[PDB]
Each structure stands twice: as C-alpha cells, then as structure tokens.
Write a protein that binds this ligand. Sequence first.
Ligand SMILES: Nc1ncnc2c1ncn2[C@@H]1O[C@H](COP(=O)(O)OP(=O)(O)NP(=O)(O)O)[C@@H](O)[C@H]1O
Ligand SMILES: Nc1ncnc2c1ncn2[C@@H]1O[C@H](COP(=O)(O)OP(=O)(O)NP(=O)(O)O)[C@@H](O)[C@H]1O
Ligand SMILES: [Mg+2]
Ligand SMILES: [Mg+2]
Ligand SMILES: [Zn+2]
Ligand SMILES: [Zn+2]
Lengths: 508, 504
Amino acid sequence: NYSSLNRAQLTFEYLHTNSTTHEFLFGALAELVDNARDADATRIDIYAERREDLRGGFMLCFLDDGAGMDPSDAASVIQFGKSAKRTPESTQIGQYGNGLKSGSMRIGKDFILFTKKEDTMTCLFLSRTFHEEEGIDEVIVPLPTWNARTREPVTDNVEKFAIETELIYKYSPFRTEEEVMTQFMKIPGDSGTLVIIFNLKLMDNGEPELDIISNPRDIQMAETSPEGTKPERRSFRAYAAVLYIDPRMRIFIHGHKVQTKRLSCCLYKPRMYKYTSSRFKTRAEQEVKKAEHVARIAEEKARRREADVKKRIKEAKQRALKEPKELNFVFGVNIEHRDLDGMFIYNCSRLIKMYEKVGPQLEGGMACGGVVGVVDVPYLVLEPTHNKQDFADAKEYRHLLRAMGEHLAQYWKDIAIAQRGIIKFWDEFGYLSANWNQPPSSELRYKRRRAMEIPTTIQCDLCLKWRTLPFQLSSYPDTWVCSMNPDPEQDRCEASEQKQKVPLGTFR
Amino acid sequence: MAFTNYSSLNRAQLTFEYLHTNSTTHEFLFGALAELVDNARDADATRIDIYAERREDLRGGFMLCFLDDGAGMDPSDAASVIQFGKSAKRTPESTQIGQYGNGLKSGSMRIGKDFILFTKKEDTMTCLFLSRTFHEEEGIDEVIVPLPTWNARTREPVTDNVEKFAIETELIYKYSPFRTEEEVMTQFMKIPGDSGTLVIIFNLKLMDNGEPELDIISNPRDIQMAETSPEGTKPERRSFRAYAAVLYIDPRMRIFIHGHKVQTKRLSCCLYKPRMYKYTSSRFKTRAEQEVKKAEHVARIAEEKARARREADVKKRIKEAKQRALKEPKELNFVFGVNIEHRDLDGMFIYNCSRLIKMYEKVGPQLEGGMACGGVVGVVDVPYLVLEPTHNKQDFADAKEYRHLLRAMGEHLAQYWKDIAIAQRGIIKFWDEFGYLSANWNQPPSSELRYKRRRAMEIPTTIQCDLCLKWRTLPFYPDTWVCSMNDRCEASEQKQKVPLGTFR
Ligand SMILES: Nc1ncnc2c1ncn2[C@@H]1O[C@H](COP(=O)(O)OP(=O)(O)NP(=O)(O)O)[C@@H](O)[C@H]1O
Ligand SMILES: Nc1ncnc2c1ncn2[C@@H]1O[C@H](COP(=O)(O)OP(=O)(O)NP(=O)(O)O)[C@@H](O)[C@H]1O
Ligand SMILES: [Mg+2]
Ligand SMILES: [Mg+2]
Ligand SMILES: [Zn+2]
Ligand SMILES: [Zn+2]
C-alpha cells in the first residue's frame, strides 16, 4: 500500500502559477464556457453584474442551463487532473481536469461557482483574496451545496459548510445567503451553472483586466486592444461564438445572444477532407493499438464492464481504422472576416489553436490567407496544452499542422480561388483595401453576396436545431425560432436536422 | 492553513492525470529540460553535467540524466519539489529562477513517462522518484512521489518513516533503471563534490514510430529532439546542448552534455555592438512603483500578523529593499546585440531574472516581415517586479504587461538598430562581411578563415574557468580552459562593459 508516500500537493502560489498558463485571458474564460458545454448546456449567459465594492469594479458571471454538477462532480473540479468525462467518443471538452481552476484564477483573484443539477445546487468558491488576507499556503476551495428546490444545505460537515458560506459572504460580491440564492435563482431551469469571477485582475493603470463598460453587451479586453488584436482575443463574445465545432448551445453575454457559429457552416465552400495526415494512418494503427493495449490494461485492472466498454472502444477504434482513421479537416474561407483566419483546431470540439497559420499560411502572402480549418481532432490523435491554447505533443502537433498544410494547399487549389484571383475573390466580399485586417465594406451588394455564399445558419431557442434559413434575423438583431422559420419542411421543432453537407475533396 | 480549521475544507488536489496535464504545459520539450537545469542553477551550480546513458530494458532505450555540483537539496527542499507552487526562491532582489514551484514536475513528465532524482547537500543524499509507469501499472489516481534520502558520506538512509523508505526504494528498483541499493548509490557517487543534483528521466514517452522522444544517438555528445531538422528549426529547440548554452543571462555555470562541456554564452556580451538600453518600458517605473507600493504595503500586512516575527523581519527586510526598489530597478536592462555566429537565431531572447523565458520571441520590427532588426538578440533580465513567466516558463503570465514590454523593446530595438546604424550602413553588407552570403535567412554563416576571424574580433572571446568559474575574456583549449592560460585565478571578475543607451 502506497499510503505513507509523499504526494504532490497544491499550494496557493500554484493557483497563480497554473493561471499563468493562460496568457490568453479569453482562453481562461473559454475553459469555463467549455465546461458548460460539457454539461450539455443549451444556454450559457455571461452577464457581468456591477459591484464596485470589490476589486475590478464588477463580477464576471457565467450562467448556463446545462447538466451542471452534483456535489461529487463539484468536488471533482478541484481534483486537479481529474476529468470524469473520460468515456467512449463523447466530445466532452474536459479531459485534462484543469481548465476552470486555470482560467478563473487568470481572470481574477477570486471566483465563486453556483452550479445546479437534479435536486442539488453546489457552490464552488475559490478565492485568492481570502488566501492573501489570511495567509493560506495550500489551496482552500470552499464547496457549499444546497437543494435545488428548497435552497436548504446539502452537505455532511456542517462546520465545513459554515466556514465555506462565511468565506463566501466575507469576500464574494454576495454578502449573504439571500444574494447567493438570488444568483442561484438566475439559473432558470432545474439544472445549470453560474460561475462568477470577482476581485478581478487590475491592469497596471488600475482598471480591471476585462472591459464591460466600453460595450455593456460584451466582455472585452480592458487593455486597449492594438489593431491586430482579433475579436476572439479582444471580445469573449467572439471567442464564445467560435468556441466549438458543434455548439449545441447559446451564449448570452450581458443578456444578449451571441450568434454562435459552428465555423464549418459559416464558410465559403466548406470542403471536408478525410485525410490520414500521413502519420494518422500510422496513428490510426497506434490509435487502434492504444485503444487495444489500454483496453488490455482495462482488462488487466478488471482481471469487467469497463474493459468491455474499452473493448467496444477498441472495436469501435478498429472501426475508426476507417472512420477516425482520417481527420475531418473542414476547410473553408472566412469571407465575413478575412483576417480572422488560420486553422481553428478543435480538439474534440474546443478551439485550442485559434488563428494558427499552417502550410502556405506560415509564409507571408495571400497563399491560403482567409482559410479557416475547423478540424475536429479527437483526443486520440492529439491533446491540447495545459492552457488549451496550444497542443501538448508538439511533435505530433507539428505533424498535424504540416498535414493540414498539404491539404490546405489541396483545398486552396481545389476551390481554385487563387487561380481565379484571390484578390478578386476578396473584392467580391467587401474587402477592397490594402490592409489585411481591414474589415469588409458594409456596402449593400457585398453584404448580400457574403450572406448568399455563407449558408445562413441559425440556432433555435427551444430545440437548438441548426437550420439553413433563406433570410436572417438573429438567434444584436431580432430573435428567431423554428416555428417562425419560413420554410416548408424546416419549420417544425421536431423536424430533422439539416447538418451541413460537406463537398469532399481528394488529394493527389 | 487552519485559522478556523480549513483542514476539513476541500483542498484542491493533484492527480496522475494532472501529471500529464502539467507536462502538457511543456509543448516545448527542451523547455521541460531547461526547467530542471534552472533548478540546478538555483542550487548555485558550478557544473551541470547532462549525460544520456544506454538502458535497453526501459522504454526509449536510454535515460536522460542531469548531474550537477551545486547546492542540491536537503529533505525539506526535496519535499518542496512536490509542494506544487512552493518556491523558496521567492525573494526580493531576486537572482533565482524559482517563482512557480513547478518546473521539475512539469518538465520531467513532458520529457518522459517516468523520472528519478538524486541530489546531495551537506550530509544528505535525497531522491525524488516520480514514475508514471508506477501509477499506470498499479492504478494510482493521486500523484505519489517517492522521497527516499541517504547520507552523503555514509550512504545510509536518513528518513523519518522507514517503511515509507522501503516502499520508495522498492518502487525505484521496480520501475527505475537502477535496481538494488548499489546501482542507485553508483548514480549518487557521480556527484563529484559533497553537494549536487543528479536527475534522471527515463521510460520516455516515445515518438510515434517507437524511438525515444529524445535522440542521443544521432550525436553522442548531445540530446537532440527525436525529430527531423526542418530548415526552420532552432538548435535550441533541436539540441539541449544549444538551449542550455543560451539558457541564462549570467551563466555562472558550465554545462557538460554527455560529459562534454557546452560553450555556455552570455548573450549579454557575446554579440556585435552590445548596448545596455536602460528603459522604464514606459511602465516599469509605474509597475515598480505599483510593486513598490504593493510589496511594501503587503509587507506591512504580513509584518502586522508576524508582529507572532520571522516574516516581520523578512517583510521589513523586503520593505526596506522595496524602498530601494524605487531607485535601482527603474529602467529595464535591455541588452541588445546582433548575433553574428547565427543570424537566424534571433528575436528577443527574453530573459527573466536570469532565465530564458521567451526564446526567439520576435518583437518590434522583427514581428514585421523583413530585415528590420533581423539578427538582434535582445537580452533583458526582466526582474520579478515587471513580469512573471508562464506555467511552462516559455511565455509570460500577464499578457497585457508582456505585450507592453515587447512593444517597449520594439521601440528600443528600433532605437538600438538606428544607434548602431547597421541597416543604414547596409545590413546586407553587414551580414556579407560577417559570413552570410545567401539570401536564405536560415543559411549558417560561411566557415572561411577570414570571416571566422572577423566574427572573432567583434565577439569578445569569452570562456569560463573550470576551477573558480570566473568568466574571462582571454586575449585574441576551446572546450577545456582555466584562469591560468590567458590573466590569473585571483583576478577580479571583469564583466565586459556595455555602452548605455538612451531613447530619442
Ligand atoms: N460551469 C460549469 N458547468 C457545468 N459543469 C462544470 C462547470 N465548470 C466545471 N464543470 C464540471 O466540473 C469539472 C471540472 O471542470 P474543469 O476544471 O474545467 O475540468 P474538466 O472540464 O474535467 N477538464 P478541462 O476542460 O480540460 O479543464 C468537469 O468535469 C465539469 O463536468
Ligand atoms: N537540481 C536542483 N538543484 C537544486 N535544487 C533543486 C533542484 N531541483 C529542484 N530543486 C529545488 O526544488 C525547488 C522546486 O523546484 P521546481 O518544482 O522546479 O520549482 P522552482 O524551481 O521553485 N520554480 P520553476 O522551476 O521556475 O517553475 C527549487 O526551487 C529548489 O529549491
Ligand atoms: Mg473543458
Ligand atoms: Mg526552476
Ligand atoms: Zn425549433
Ligand atoms: Zn581560475
């Protein structure tokens, strides 16, 4: 028994250190939103309440309507590394068990959670202000929980509970149970989660690190975003918009829907290439071997259904000796924004690499300028970094970027817009200036032309079924639902999805 | 802490899956190596020998070993290398690399699956066995880091819990390259002095084809990446020989890769026209004032509590030092310099308290495609008041302040570029006279005698001693050298003077 041996233990300065992985602050926010997706949320509202008594002048909230957490899955949040999402297929962004703790501490000193599921509403209050003011060396994470209906406590150790709630009412924006329950009641359904991040990182000037004052319908960099700063890194509304390859969920920043995007739908000629990346034909076999030998490990530890689950993964991975033997590179040219380009690498539906230039994009020029990648990389091909803004296995990752370079050139010469004239193509979509970062002209003809080539896709508000409208309203223009959809078959709420047909290209 | 008994309260805990996640911060594998050798420098190391043996019984066929002669660790400082975040190197007027208490545990696990430490200090011989093969084979969820320690002289166990020691050594002999006490002791005695650190990283992750992740066989004197050599690929990201060479701003350290000294180079004063631009970043006086306002203030807060008293004297000693932080550290030490030995190995070598945190991070004009400031290896000991590293210690945490600092060095990189007036005096002609006769920016400089000697004149030919390790600049052998070959051991440390630069 390995009970007396020393264990690695977190410390206060490790919270700072782990947050330091997030040089990308909207990446830090994006991790908390990823967890909301992994709870199968349909909405994730990201309003920021205005409390000036705290540092930063406000609180950064993440409301959602998903499958939240039970107290066990709440305690699994502070178990660094632990991700219960580990399971067959199951996009489930969380694999590393460290994105929320990584991000909420890059975002501000403190953070308070208000998850909810079934008949439980767990709170997860981790505050570095408490730690600094009381001299904490470890990582003390208050974990109080109440009942979803009665809003009465659900926890074994009452003294622990009292300490947790006392710290919440001592450092949190919410100085009593009444305001904490108000925050809980913001969760409209019987399951969901509200993550607030408070005592926010003050910039060198004194303002918080996140602006909610310049645009009250958005969370932006309080740093003056210098020109080249992309919306996704200067607006978490943009990041949440493009945060997933298949967002079956809506984002309400400041009570205002983000027009979320699959990023495969909203592109010009979204051609999908079934490529074995050269290596992934080898890492299809090793993927079969990985699922086989680890199912053998699953059998060894079992020596039962967990091995059977992993054995069915192995035969499902021997089926992935065809199906995920090749990565789905959904290349497409972003005509809405030319400069917001580069392979949007989705490691199982989470944007890890945004604006990563590969292939002809690495060398300067119009070669593959504009092309968005939208690859749904599984966690078998490759895994992200600690910050989930780079990729861990840099060897296999450079190999995947090289493979996407070959097939990005393939997509480039298959659509052949450069042969027809890349500059003329861009002129056809509003861009008639020299600077590559110049947004498209608001000119009517170019707006219509962009709206046409883009399959005008829009989620619903009840069933969330992505349709292909002849028009656009919204859902910051007016809202929309399937029932008001003017289309003969795609009008019923229960009508089958019309998930985008992808014209597949061929190499060589 | 307890105060109101937070012991009951849920503490955040690390897991085996977090060992992988932590290693994933190191997408950069020689960055993972650099973390261990940084800790060696934090030991005040004279030598760090980095030898890669041949062990076919293990995964990868070899073990990556990190021998040094520094101050090593004691049992307490060893247990501190698994207190994630804990870093006793956190001090004012910092010269160490340690802030984040996580470079060994982040890097040994990126490097390879498992890893075993050995280290020496005073009369202790401590081991930090942390093997992930162990966790994978016996189904361990929590990070379990075996901690055996021996006496440096008697080779006798020194540990409170003897059954714990037995389990630690048993795991070492189960998964480590070294079975039985004798082979572990043989590894210990490689530490030549009475203090040092031998970290071995073994059972490597393997490149997908089955080779180890670190090729030592292509060059038996080096640890190369088990990966090809693209045209665009730095030797520092292709060879830890090169990385450990350029890893420190003040390398009072020789580095012996495969028992062969690396020519560690002060990028402060090993280039053409080094210039010390003392710039306040347009922020640093404010950031230093903010830190002087903060650290002095929080010093009172901790001193108020200890006014218990060790922290109060420490905080008072910090606070007075933080009053001197208002004067001496007001302008960032930007040591700009044009690297003539390798022009393609350029961009600001962003050091940070004597550790290369952001290697090859092009700023300013270098971010813009062209020859503007191409070759200028900017070198700045960014103190721990201005900026702090990232989790991987390959970026910087505060991205706003980092971008502002890079914009500041872009401004003063343009300033340095015009002051030397190298582009004015035909940057193409400059590179032509210093070896490079190709439009290819990667193409290494020509090896003709005239051009090599011409590069030798500009570079002060600097070589480190092997006895007192006093840097010397012998008048104009190349791998072994001592002070009495120039001009003597007792000579004072003569640091190459740098012409100070001023903006506008
Ligand atoms: N806002 C949230 N809504 C719902 N579930 C959440 C939320 N935040 C965290 N969780 C859950 O709590 C756990 C911890 O999240 P996190 O620390 O992000 O680890 P992970 O999501 O498992 N992995 P990663 O996404 O790599 O960090 C997860 O297993 C999620 O299921
Ligand atoms: N080779 C070594 N020589 C001496 N001390 C060491 C060595 N390796 C680790 N240590 C000690 O262990 C501490 C923790 O190491 P580590 O986990 O790398 O964090 P850190 O070195 O404090 N910070 P960083 O490495 O910059 O993230 C060091 O600060 C030293 O006190
Ligand atoms: Mg996640
Ligand atoms: Mg270190
Ligand atoms: Zn509907
Ligand atoms: Zn000497």
